[PDB]
Structure 1
């Protein structure tokens, strides 16, 4: 029953939340390593007309 099993099963939601937070933090840390994006000699690519960044 709602508002009753929540008080007994609230703990279960924590691990899944951590997985999402870790994914978000991984992307945020990825955003700080773009000093060479579209600058490597191997993947110097000219941007598409409706493109901002080659990868995110």
Structure 2
């Protein structure tokens, strides 16, 4: 019976999916501005024995 329910209320996932897509695109934008990661004079720091990057 879920066919009619889906074809009537499938418009309710467009906005949440857009929210997740926007979060993913914000992360993709963030990954292109790492030219000074762990390089500022105020926050320059030695890496921990395991971690690879100070922030993502």
- State the distance in 1 between where 2:2 and 2:50 align: 48
- Structure 2: state its 5+ residue gaps: none
- Structure 1: state its 5+ residue gaps: none
Deviations 1:3-26 (A, max 9, x none): 220000011110000000000000
What TM-score, normalized by structure 1, do the two folds share? 0.96
The answer to which structure has the higher helix fraction is 2
Deviations 1:23-53 (A, max 9, x none): 0000000000000000000001000000100
Runs of 4+ in 1 over 2 A off after TM superposition: none
- State the distance in 2 between where 1:4 and 1:11 align: 13
**Structural RMSD (CA):** 0.7
